[PDB]
Amino acid sequence: VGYDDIGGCRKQLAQIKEMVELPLRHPALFKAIGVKPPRGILLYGPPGTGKTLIARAVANETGAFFFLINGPEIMSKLAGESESNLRKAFEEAEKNAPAIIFIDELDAIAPKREKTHGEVERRIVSQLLTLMDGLKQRAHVIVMAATNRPNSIDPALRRFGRFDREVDIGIPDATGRLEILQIHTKNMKLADDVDLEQVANETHGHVGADLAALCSEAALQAIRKKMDAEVMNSLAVTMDDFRWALSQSNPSALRETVVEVPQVTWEDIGGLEDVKRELQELVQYPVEHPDKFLKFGMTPSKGVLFYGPPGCGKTLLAKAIANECQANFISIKGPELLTMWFGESEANVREIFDKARQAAPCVLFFDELDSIAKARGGDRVINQILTEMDGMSTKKNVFIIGATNRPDIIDPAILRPGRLDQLIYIPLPDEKSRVAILKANLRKSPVAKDVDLEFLAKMTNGFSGADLTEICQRACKLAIRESIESEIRRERERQTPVPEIRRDHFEEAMRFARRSVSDNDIRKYEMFAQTL
Amino acid sequence: VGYDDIGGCRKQLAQIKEMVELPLRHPALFKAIGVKPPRGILLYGPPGTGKTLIARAVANETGAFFFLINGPEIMSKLAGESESNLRKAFEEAEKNAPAIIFIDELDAIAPKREKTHGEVERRIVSQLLTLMDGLKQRAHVIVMAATNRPNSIDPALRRFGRFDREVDIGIPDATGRLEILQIHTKNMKLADDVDLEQVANETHGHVGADLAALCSEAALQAIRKKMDAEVMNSLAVTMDDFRWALSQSNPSALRETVVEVPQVTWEDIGGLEDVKRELQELVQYPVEHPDKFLKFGMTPSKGVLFYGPPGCGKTLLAKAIANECQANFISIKGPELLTMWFGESEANVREIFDKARQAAPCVLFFDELDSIAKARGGDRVINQILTEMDGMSTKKNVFIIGATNRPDIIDPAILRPGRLDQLIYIPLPDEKSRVAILKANLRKSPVAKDVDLEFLAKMTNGFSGADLTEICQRACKLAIRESIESEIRRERERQTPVPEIRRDHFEEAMRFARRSVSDNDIRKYEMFAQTL
């Protein structure tokens, strides 16, 4: 029970705990600073990490009394006793200076006032905000507040003096998932057979409660394996029990955004690394020497775009720059662009931009402008996008990564200054870069070195890296088909090793000659670069 | 009264009963596991199977006390006594550890809070969730909850700690219908004349209550046959009484989706069985050797599509792959595609995808892209479809079966990776495959072998299998017309056997020469395959 019980929330938890322990350890020296007695901790975010339990554990780690609030109980109780409970919270903050005022189900307590028809409920919200505004700033009661999002939050409650700061839940790490597994490994009796890291790498879309449920699913599989107080020492959480849990795993945290760093850092492919050095001067030289930008006297730019083979390493180039920045990435989904354009929902894109302002620094992969442009041609949200492009200052400088293969007809104001400055003419790979992509495909692949990639790159100079990855997946499919064939022959004949890919599958993919590249698209990219 | 009383719900009933009997038989060893004390059983689904009675029977089979709740009575009663009844449920869970807390009409108890204007009702929902959150996790009271769907369910109630798991009603089997008929056959006195299986095969769109009503309709027909305590031994539920019930049968379970396996498994037609082996490597080789996919190091694909004769065995090919997988199928209805595109309703398609995520593994027959594409040309829902195509991981791998006869202009992002990989150029059948279709049409047909199918396939090489099935139905119509003519001649002359189809009807259909195949469509499929 402490800060080690949560895995995957390092920075914001540290900042909030520093803000707490500034008043908690030294309330007298906090008054000697006298800067800001803030209390409002508005955790807007998804539960399942035990965020209220994280608040109670932070109270235990600070030693503060968890004077928590169940707002559903206040909604359950009759009125007045809710006001008496607010007065009880005030008298508890008087009685205990280290009172952890933890507001749970606050969106139920505080909805939109237009949505609120309950005048007793609105009076209770007024009494709660009046209790919130009625602060002597001396009782040291931190107003922890739990929400799923701040959309239901009233702006008067979200005003300063009623709100101090907000906390996002975020996406937990697979390392943080292994930490939560270790938290579940207090009475594990695991088999030491499930990896709990690559398994945790596979555990996207799962909360820590979903991790405990997967532990329960492995336990149910083990209970089925036991088939009947004797098999308790025979508990062994295998990777097969993990596979039963994973087949039982539905994505609990599905349909949500996440900001995260990849692990490529141009090791998938090099080439045009002057543009990578331009990104490095954009990132680290601003990160190290903003005073050199002052000495130059010109401000930094906002973003750049790309033209050519879209996604064929290009989305991997965005992820690789995020790895190279060691910074959290987020990509503009084209289906969300249709939901903003044809679906007509663009304020949520402004909400995502404001979330990125809360998550600054980050990476803005604004891909697929050509797709929404051809959807309109075969914008209003792009007006909001350009408004945000003007609306972003040089506060942590979340760089724009524009990407369109047919970028020749997108937008001139986006092409104008106050926006992105470069359009990366991303060409096809070299045969050296093709061999680099071949080695990257050989990474996480147990194929032998029996084939000649130099002759393969010499043949497939006119093939895409995505077409090369397709050839790698096709050779892996042929090898898996050969492994399944060997298993079928062993079951059919031997029961009644083929761990690599031969150059026969390479020659089979070579005879499978479907070069997906279009020379008219090359001429179009050439006309765009000639226009550039 | 037990698990045999329900027919047609095997897997989910077993999983929930295993979860129950883990705490029911060994609550001490469940604490020795200590994994998850879950109680929330959210049966969202249609009634008429006696699902609340299934809950009470599961309580009887576990020996637990059915401490059920009538939420309509709580809505009927004045407030406070509802809170006293919730306290009574808590004190009953204290008094009886094996308490089956069965919540009935929960959507009436818990609607949408925006829809909820009742502040006393919202306070009662808050008191119920506070009772639900107020768990010591020791009273062993499983929170069985009954809903039609989870749409009316509040997400705070659907949150973890308030919700554990959900149960779908599903489509009962015709074997399960015969089991429910056997449940009705405790005081049957049937004639042993109604089949109760082929009759149950005919009983689509009927609940178990509709089965008891059909028993009542046969009883009413028998009461009309009796015409007046003496005919009780003269009770005889005939197939004529079954026909009276079936004429009386309206489809009770009409307008709903269902996921089910067919019984073809490429026995209707063979041909291009390398694609069937590709589906087999996609299904069973993933089902047997996902570790071989790990050893290959490349992940599996998502789906494939088809081009050519649409539905002429092609929908039967989807159903045959579902039979070959022995797995539940579901097809994208084109009228639902118009209701998503022109009717503008695509979140319910995401709801169907999430239901398939609850019903994983399943088959996604995403047919008729060309129809909605030409409807737009003569998409926003397709944006959600592509979002779901990206939104599906390799968790039980519900394969996409795309199908369009005019697939040449559908969507490039669907044609892009992260989506389906193959477009099956489904050609016209061979004369061997035409004879196979002739034998399949001869299945469930009492026609003789007097005609020559080899000469018939030799003539109708340029005819479709759907055109061949049309010829089979036309010959069956001519045979039925001949049987009706023989009956009219017997009634008109003999009262005052023709069980097969002659080759005369074959030559009549042969002279009925309307080959529906278009050679320009063949040229279009050829241009598509040349583009492929």
Q: From CA B204, how far away is CA B258, in angstroms rounded? A: 11
Q: How far is CA A294 from the centre of its chain?
A: 33
Best of B30, B39, B83, B298 to mutate (most A CBs within 10 Å, chain A): B298
Tell whether the torsion through CA atoms of A194, A195, A197 and A199 is positive or negative: negative
**Concatenated DSSP letters of A442-473:** HTT----S-S-HHHHHHHGGGS-HHHHHHHHH
Residue with tokens 């020296």: A29
Contact A335 B384 (CB under 8 A): yes
- Answer yes or no: is B505 a known binding residue: no
Q: Which two tokens stand for residue B440?
A: 């399949």
Q: Name which of B303, B402, B392 is nearest B356 in CA terms.
A: B392
CB contact under 8 A, A73 and B126: yes
Smallest CA-to-CA distance from B312 within B157, B441, B503, B480 is with B441
Integer CA distances (angstroms), B174 to A139, B59, B171, B512, in order: 69, 26, 9, 39
CA distance B67 to B83: 16
* Chain B (8-37) residues lying within 8 Å, Cβ to Cβ, of chain A: 18-19, 22, 26, 28-29, 32-36
Q: What are the tokens at A241? A: 């029990």
A212: nearest CB among B19, B35, B386? B35
Q: Given strand A423-425, what is the order of strands in its sheet?
A: A328-331, A362-367, A399-403, A303-307, A423-425
Q: Which two tokens stand for residue A106?
A: 């606050």
What are the DSSP E strand ranges found in B416-485? Answer: 423-425
Q: How far apart are CA A64 and CA A66, in angstroms?
A: 6
Which H/E stretch holds residue B144?
strand B142-147
CA B205, distance to chain mean position in Å, is 10
Distance CA A420, CA B299 (A): 36
Instruction: For chain A, say whether B191 makes contact (Cβ under 8 Å).
Output: no
Instruction: Identify whether the C-beta of residue A246 lies closer than 8 Å to the C-beta of residue A419.
Output: no
Q: What is the DSSP string of A469-508?
A: HHHHHHHHHHHHHHHHHHHHHIIIII-----S--HHHHHH
What order do you get walking across the sheet with B142-147 strand by strand? B69-70, B100-104, B142-147, B41-44, B165-168
Which of B347, B345, B310 minimizes the C-alpha distance to B331? B310
Answer whether A249 sits within 8 Å of B281, measured CB to CB.
Answer: no
Q: Nearest C-alpha of chain B: how many angstroms from A14?
A: 27
Task: Give the contacts of B398 (CB within 8 A, at least 6 positions apart).
Answer: B356, B357, B360, B361, B362, B363, B364, B392
Residue B65 dihedral angles phi and psi, to the nearest 5°:
-75, 125
* C-alpha to C-alpha distances, A424 to A309, A332, A382, nearest whole angstrom: 10, 18, 21
Resolution (A): 6.1
Q: Which residues of B touch A213 (CB under 8 A)?
A: 36, 38
Please give the Cα distance from A480 to A474 (Å, whole number).
10
B297 contacts A445? CB cut-off 8 A: yes
CB A425 within 8 A of CB A330: no
Residue B199 CB-half CA count within 13 A: 25
B383 has a chain A CB within 8 A of its CB: yes
Tally the residues of chain B. Answer: 532
Out of B19, B28, B126, whose CB is closest to A72? B126
In this structure, what are the phi and psi dihedrals at residue B186, rounded to the nearest 5 degrees?
A: -110, -30
Pairing of strands B142-147, B41-44: parallel
CB B190 within 8 A of CB B221: no
Rounded Cα distance between A132 and A160, Å, is 11
Residue among B98, B101, B106 at smallest CA distance from B153: B106
Q: Which residues 424-443 on chain B approach chain A with CB closer than 8 angstroms? A: none
Residues of A with CB below 8 A from B87's CB?
A: none
Q: Which strands, in side-by-side order, build the sheet including A142-147? A: A69-70, A100-104, A142-147, A41-44, A165-168
**How was it solved?**
cryo-EM
- The Cα-based distances of A159 to A129, A163, A348 in angstroms read 10, 5, 21
With tokens 């009494």, the residue in question is: A127
Nearest to B385 by CA among B401, B399, B366: B366
Q: Residue positions of A in the annotated binding site for ATP?
A: 47-53, 148, 184, 311-316
Q: How far apart are CA B369 and CA B376, in angstroms?
A: 11
Question: Residue B246 in contact with residue B202, Cβ under 8 Å?
Answer: yes
CB-based contact (8 Å) between A478 and chain B? no
> What is the DSSP code (8-state) at residue A326?
T
CA angle A483, A486, A487 (to 5 degrees): 85
Q: Going by C-beta distance under 8 Å and a sequence separation of 6 or more, which residues neighbour residue B420?
A: B301, B302, B303, B304, B305, B389, B400, B402, B414
Q: Are strands B423-425 and B362-367 parallel, antiparallel or unpaired?
A: unpaired
Q: How remote is the C-alpha of A352 from its chain's centroid?
A: 12
Angstrom distance (rounded) from CA A73 to CA A90: 17
- Chain B contacts of A481, Cβ < 8 Å? 281, 285
B78 in reach of chain A (CB within 8 A): no
Q: With left for phi above 0 and alpha for psi between -120 and 50, is residue A131 left, alpha or beta?
A: alpha
Alpha-carbon span A235 to A382, nearest angstrom = 57
DSSP A67-119: --EEHHHHHHSPTTHHHHHHHHHHHHHHH-SSBEEEEESHHHHS--TTT---H
The β-bridge partners of B104 are B70
Residue A100 pairs in a beta bridge with A142
- The rounded distance, in Å, linking the Cα atoms of B511 and B260 is 40
Which residues touch B353 (CB under 8 Å, ≥6 apart)? B388, B391, B392
Q: Is B362 annotated as a binding residue?
A: no
Tokens for B400?
């996409």
Residue B315 marked as a ligand binder: yes
Angle ∠(B200,B202,B206) on CA atoms, nearest 5: 75
Smallest CA-to-CA distance from B368 within B309, B312, B310 is with B310
Backbone angles phi, psi at A243, to 5 degrees: -70, -35
Answer whether B328's CB lies under 8 Å from B322's CB: yes
Longest dimension (CA), chain A: 84
What's CA A472's distance to the chain center, in Å?
A: 28
What is the distance between the alpha carbons of residues A409 and A373, in angstroms, rounded to a whole number? 8
For residue A252, list chain B residues with Cβ-Cβ distance below 8 A.
160
Kindly state whether B345 is in contact with chain A, defined as any CB-CB distance less than 8 angstroms. no
Single-letter amino acid code for the residue at B271: G
d(CA B19, CA B38): 8
